[PDB]
Amino acid sequence: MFTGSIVAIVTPMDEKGNVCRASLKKLIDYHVASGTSAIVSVGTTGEFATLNHDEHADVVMMTLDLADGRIPVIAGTGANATAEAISLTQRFNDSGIVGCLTVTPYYNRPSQEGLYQHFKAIAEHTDLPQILYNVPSRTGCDLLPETVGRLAKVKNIIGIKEATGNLTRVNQIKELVSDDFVLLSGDDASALDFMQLGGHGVISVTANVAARDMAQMCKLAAEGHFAEARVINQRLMPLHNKLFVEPNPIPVKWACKELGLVATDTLRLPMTPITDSGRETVRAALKHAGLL
Amino acid sequence: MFTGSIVAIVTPMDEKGNVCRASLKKLIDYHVASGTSAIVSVGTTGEFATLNHDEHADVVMMTLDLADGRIPVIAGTGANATAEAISLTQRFNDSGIVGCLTVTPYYNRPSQEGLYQHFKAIAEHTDLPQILYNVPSRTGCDLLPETVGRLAKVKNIIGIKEATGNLTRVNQIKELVSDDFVLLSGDDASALDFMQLGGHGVISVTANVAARDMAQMCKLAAEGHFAEARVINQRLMPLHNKLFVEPNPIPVKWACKELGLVATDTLRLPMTPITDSGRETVRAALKHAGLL
Amino acid sequence: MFTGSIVAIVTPMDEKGNVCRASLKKLIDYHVASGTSAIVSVGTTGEFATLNHDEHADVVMMTLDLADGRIPVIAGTGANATAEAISLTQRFNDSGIVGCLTVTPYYNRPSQEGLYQHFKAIAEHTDLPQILYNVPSRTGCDLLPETVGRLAKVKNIIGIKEATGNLTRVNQIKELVSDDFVLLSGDDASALDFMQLGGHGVISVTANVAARDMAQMCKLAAEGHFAEARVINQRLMPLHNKLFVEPNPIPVKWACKELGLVATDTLRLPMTPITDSGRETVRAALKHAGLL
Amino acid sequence: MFTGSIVAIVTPMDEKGNVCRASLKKLIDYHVASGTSAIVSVGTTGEFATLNHDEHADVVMMTLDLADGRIPVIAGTGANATAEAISLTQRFNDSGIVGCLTVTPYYNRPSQEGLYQHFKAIAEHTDLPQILYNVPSRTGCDLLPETVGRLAKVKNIIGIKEATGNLTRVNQIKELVSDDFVLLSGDDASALDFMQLGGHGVISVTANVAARDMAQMCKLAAEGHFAEARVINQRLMPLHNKLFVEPNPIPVKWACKELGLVATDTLRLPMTPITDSGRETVRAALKHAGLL
Ligand SMILES: N[C@@H](CCCC[NH3+])C(=O)O
Ligand SMILES: N[C@@H](CCCC[NH3+])C(=O)O
Ligand SMILES: N[C@@H](CCCC[NH3+])C(=O)O
Numbered sequence A, B, C, D: 001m002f003t004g005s006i007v008a009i010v011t012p013m014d015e016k017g018n019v020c021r022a023s024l025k026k027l028i029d030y031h032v033a034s035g036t037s038a039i040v041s042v043g044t045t046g047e048f049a050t051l052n053h054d055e056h057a058d059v060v061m062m063t064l065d066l067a068d069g070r071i072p073v074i075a076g077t078g079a080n081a082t083a084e085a086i087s088l089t090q091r092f093n094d095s096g097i098v099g100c101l102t103v104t105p106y107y108n109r110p111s112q113e114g115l116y117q118h119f120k121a122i123a124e125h126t127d128l129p130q131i132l133y134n135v136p137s138r139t140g141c142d143l144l145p146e147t148v149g150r151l152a153k154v155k156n157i158i159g160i161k162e163a164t165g166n167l168t169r170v171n172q173i174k175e176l177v178s179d180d181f182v183l184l185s186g187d188d189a190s191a192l193d194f195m196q197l198g199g200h201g202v203i204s205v206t207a208n209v210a211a212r213d214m215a216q217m218c219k220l221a222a223e224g225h226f227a228e229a230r231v232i233n234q235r236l237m238p239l240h241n242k243l244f245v246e247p248n249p250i251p252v253k254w255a256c257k258e259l260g261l262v263a264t265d266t267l268r269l270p271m272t273p274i275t276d277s278g279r280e281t282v283r284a285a286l287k288h289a290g291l292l
């Protein structure tokens, strides 16, 4: 499933920074019960940067095992070296994942032609559906609509997670791609606006703690009931902002712990523990959303 | 050597994308002959993002072997996960390298407290001198002067490669650190200005192809001879700019090949070959510098 | 009328830079015939900066006289000194204009409290409806949604021309104001997106040369027929971009001359004549729109 | 005087918002006593946007009268319409002022060719020396070095007030102009850095309240005594920053009142009175500088 409310799931960790199977199970059951459309495993929110390849694969496989066919799983498979992205993708071929979420190379700042060759090569060597991921504030590069249009001609490049927050991208991309190419927001605070403009859903941090409200918001949006959706969005807006009051996923993991969905809020360095002021801001946002 | 003209040396490749030992040897001998102060091996210009750690370590160790004590070698040791940076640094402990160039974590956008903990942990696991490296355009993170002050208190944190191009940082940092903390430019086009303000040298892309000129410019700067240094700077200004006409190190590798310093200008995806328009721009800059 | 396609009309000039009544008459008749909703007289596009107060008033009065009740006229009344804005507003009280378009103070960078006091004072001393105008790229300040919400409580502050191009502003402002407060785009290239998000129309440069297509696009948008509207928008998109290929209103005045709507394309310094390359780009855009 | 510590003097007002002659006289005598090099009358800090031309001219002429040949007076003469800038400059022809400070047109965003024609036309209508003034954060326009080169060829264009805070501009401009073209900082917090790179002085907000310290710092800089100049700079750094805690000249007028240099801290809308939090910040900065 590549539409509606898709959660960019936290990778819950014990105090040692190793994946907590019991916490992950509780999250997955929560998403199944709450109507989340799909789970993005080891995306940005899942701390892909600080897992090594083996651990990253372990988490995807554990998520599939625990999901047990009840909810679709999309794996984070991005890398900043094209060989590495291919390699990681091969580990998931015939795993049971429904598709891959693949970020533009970060740090090295390739040209648009470099991005085209990068994604073309990755798509060539899998039959899995690929969702491109643009997040310039993290990567230092910006995958432009023209290049997205070029890549959407590749059979198994099927959509894009657009995380610029620049809403003009929706229709710039839509006019260059076929009607079946999926446009997903990667920016919770602008996601409803993104859907109103023609987007198909959101790959969401907020959904980690407000899964039912997110699922109902995205359904209302898909039906054209934007005023109704916007009531939900306004109750969620403090979370859409304050889940980034300190670096994601610091706030959302604390929030998941506060709700009892995970055993510990531990992250891996260079992510550090939430500050006291951050706890108080996040808690206020959870209360605004009616979750505590 | 942590002052003067420090080359961020290319990792020259064969057509297959693997390190070319003959080319690396030619470069290194060139830098010895030219008066380059030190070599940074597998920095940004050396394609650290697209080598695996073993490959990265092999290039560093080959560069150290070829230098044969003639010129000091600083290893690139940055990573966006602290555990991984520690692992890479530990490869070089007792190796012969003189210190480490360690970039702020990229993509994951840690807080300043996160940056402090990351670099502190790395410095704790080595006796080697650490040069911090700030380049927000690539990493999505900005290591601010206050945090650089805090880190300069750690015994073996000894300098910073400041690649913002924001020259106010020179004196902001200088006033927070001891007189022996080294300030190096990471931005060729502003590097003479950076030294004029108090900086100690440059870690340079341009030095790959104008090593003698860069070394002479930096020596004149260190002596307070700014007007003479500026004449050299003006002759190199088109390279300082046009070596970034396409993404670094695409132009500089081509320039190295054009000068006969390396056998091929091959890079790894997502870096792609220089365009025809790029070749003509870079050739014009080399001709301006009197190198061709 | 404060909805649909509203033209930010050029101030046509003879070769001496004085207002050309005959050219203005032809424009006004064109707008009446083509279904434009209203005319903004001496806005940005009408070169408010380079008319003195007497000339500025002359042009508004001439536009009202020529309109002869057939189309509503909104006067540009902005200034960067609150006394000056009041003064200019008084000149229009009981003139026949339907409202005023009042820009945030430029150059002096007031606080949000300063903007609130500025606009509150101007509104106090007129019974004319006021449309706030935010264009940070010109002014150096940004009138934020919170302050817009404060000002919308003032009885005769009735809407806002939002020219940031940042589409998140639509619903940030809408949630803070009453249902009858008018949201108008000031950014042609994002205007259709702006209306799709809940905006009520556009104060347009493009409408100067494509008045009928703009009027039909904004009606389709108001009816919810966005796919239909978007076909029109895509034929207009090169004009929405290339009317800013050189500083507005340089391109649009040339385009008006090329279509025969005005006798000369003359502007006042510091605006200068269109370049040859600009003529060719603008002409291509007019052809794309089917106007030549 | 177009070098050293040049004060962008406040236009002190009474409670009604009109120029206070006794306060202006106290300031001017202060600057004579302190060793200020020159006074810029009705620059940005002097509230040029909210005086009418007659008022503006009266303040300039009063400042010239009060200076009584003791200290040179440069008039602010900028406008965003060329005709208006010419008119204002012509007011001061044969007046006693030593030159003119003329800002790039604001709001209307002319091209570089437009800037060239604007300043050329103004210089043609006077024998007075012209200092260009670039401050893109306020004007929406950036007068680039290439254009500054082109204008420096006009006989009576003799310098530039560079208020970008982008220190690379010093040497970019210096290499395109003659050795006698003057480079002055418009940015107090980077001004010592600017002089260290080659600049000749500063047109300063801080000098309104730390005139002796600023004059001593600039003299030390001119002599090449940078380390001693930096000690003074560090003592003034909180003022350099906190005089912009609210919009200039709100903080500096309050500071002048607090020091007894002016009778009231009144400004004209849209500038508004300093907040209580602002007063406490500025008082802390004055105490740091040892002025209180
Ligand atoms: N820390 C490295 C490797 C991560 C590998 C597994 N996801 C990066 O962000 O590219
Ligand atoms: N491509 C990954 C791993 C590089 C590992 C060796 N230098 C990154 O940029 O972090
Ligand atoms: N040129 C000045 C005065 C214009 C007055 C009439 N609109 C400005 O842009 O504020």
Ligand SMILES: N[C@@H](CCCC[NH3+])C(=O)O
Binding pocket: C079, C080, C081, C084, C107, D048, D049, D050, D051, D052, D053, D056, D079, D080
């Ligand atoms: N407030 C108008 C006119 C100022 C005229 C005298 N200084 C402007 O900023 O251009």
Ligand SMILES: [K+]
Binding pocket: A123, A124, A125, A126, A127, A156
């Ligand atoms: K395939």
Ligand SMILES: [K+]
Binding pocket: A151, A152, A153, A154, A155, A156, A157, A158
């Ligand atoms: K496809």
Ligand SMILES: [K+]
Binding pocket: B151, B152, B153, B154, B155, B156, B157, B158
């Ligand atoms: K140290």
Ligand SMILES: [K+]
Binding pocket: C123, C124, C125, C126, C127, C156
């Ligand atoms: K009123």
Ligand SMILES: [K+]
Binding pocket: C151, C152, C153, C154, C155, C156, C157, C158
């Ligand atoms: K109202």
Ligand SMILES: [K+]
Binding pocket: D151, D152, D153, D154, D155, D156, D157, D158
């Ligand atoms: K000159």
